[PDB]
């Protein structure tokens, strides 16, 4: 119901998010994923590291430069999981993937914007408690991603700025709600209450 | 598109091509190389289309073409036009 | 990775480094860092910024 949808990857499952996103792009919705480093996978760390190693040992033998390119970042892991769903070898699939943008962390201009979630892809809702899960920043740093220490240092600044913003907005909202409560009990407000507002 | 996944490639290429082609079409229209509408006075719809007669009447009204006229055919056209105007005059009278 | 966001040069430079910037030195007017030296004016607001 929007021109563009920003999705916070925190607390989500890679494959389910990939499925819903792919079917949205193929329908024509523009989507932007952020905080891929906080993304989650089902199963313990060991299993998924073993899986990535199984993927990593695969390579064209007579020339390694033309084989499966093993991208280490969480954004690229998610992009792989997604591209395997889309028929990316078609113009339709290319145009679909060109409606997508994946980012580690929340950079500008999306930091000053609203983010959403997908409840049929969240870990806490889809998984049963008492089940091991894996996080993608840890996995990528294990398999050779050399940037997890900068993204944390930057998110620690973004969060402070956002907290200042929220502390301002929350006092403004208190003022507004108090003024509205004082305006209430007027006959205009009674009519609005009757009509459902 | 793998080295830059967050950059559109094909949509930009197609934007470029469609604008490419639209400009060329508009200029081919401005240069009068495309044929006019069906009802315009200079149009040739329902008539016969022959570059020989077109060149004949153009050189009677009297920058590189493959269109010539074959003086043989020019003499033939003058002959047949004399016959045509003879018949028209016999209608005359 | 690492990104360069600004580079600052000195006021006066030698014909040697100017030659490094140039590829046909004997024909040029040698106009390399003129406007930068001009940007090194009274207080150097840009330089200090």
């Amino acid at each position: 119901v929007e021109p563009v949808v920003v999705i916070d990857g925190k607390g989500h499952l890679v494959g389910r998010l990939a499925s819903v996103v792919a079917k949205q792009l193929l329908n024509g919705q523009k989507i932007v994923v952020v905080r891929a480093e906080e993304l989650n996978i089902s199963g313990e760390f060991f299993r998924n590291k073993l899986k990535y190693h199984d993927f990593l040992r695969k390579a064209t033998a007579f020339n390694k430069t033309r084989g499966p390119f093993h991208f280490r970042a969480p954004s690229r892991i998610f992009y792989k999981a997604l591209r395997g769903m889309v028929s990316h070898k078609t113009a339709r699939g290319k145009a679909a993937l060109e409606r997508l943008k994946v980012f580690e962390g929340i950079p500008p201009p999306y930091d000053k914007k609203k983010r959403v979630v997908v409840p049929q892809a969240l870990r806490v809702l889809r998984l049963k408690p008492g089940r091991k899960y894996t996080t993608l920043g840890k996995l990528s740093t294990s398999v050779g991603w050399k940037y997890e220490d900068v993204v944390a240092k930057l998110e620690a600044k973004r969060k402070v700025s956002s907290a200042e913003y929220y502390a301002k907005k929350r006092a403004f909202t208190k003022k507004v709600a108090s003024a509205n409560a004082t305006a209430a009990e007027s006959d205009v407000a009674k009519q609005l209450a009757a009509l459902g507002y | 598109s793998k080295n830059s996944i967050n950059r559109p490639k094909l949509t930009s290429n197609l934007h470029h091509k469609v604008h490419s082609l639209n400009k060329k079409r508009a200029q081919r229209e401005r240069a009068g190389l495309l044929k006019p509408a069906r009802s315009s006075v200079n149009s040739k719809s329902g008539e016969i289309k022959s570059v020989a007669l077109d060149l004949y009447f153009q050189n009677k009204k009297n920058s590189i073409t493959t269109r010539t006229l074959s003086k043989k055919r020019a003499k033939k056209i003058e002959r047949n036009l004399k016959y045509a105007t003879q018949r028209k005059l016999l209608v005359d009278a | 990775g690492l990104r360069s966001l600004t580079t600052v040069w000195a006021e006066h430079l030698s014909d040697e480094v100017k030659r490094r910037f140039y590829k046909n030195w004997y024909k040029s007017k040698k106009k390399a860092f003129t406007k930068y030296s001009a940007k090194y004016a009274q207080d150097g607001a840009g330089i200090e910024r």
């Binding site: 563009v4 523009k30 409606r99 943008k101 950079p107 500008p108 201009p109 999306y110 | 830059s4 967050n6 950059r7 559109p8 949509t11 930009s12 934007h15 470029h16 | 940007k39 840009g46 910024r49």
Partner: peptide, 27 residues
């Protein structure tokens, strides 16, 4: 800004990017 030419050059780059749709962050 840097106030001399970076302003014009950067706004022109961004508008070329937004007309050709060749921008990494913006659509």
């Amino acid at each position: 800004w840097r106030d001399g030419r970076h302003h014009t050059y950067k706004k022109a780059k961004l508008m070329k990017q937004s007309k050709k749709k060749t921008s990494f962050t913006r659509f």
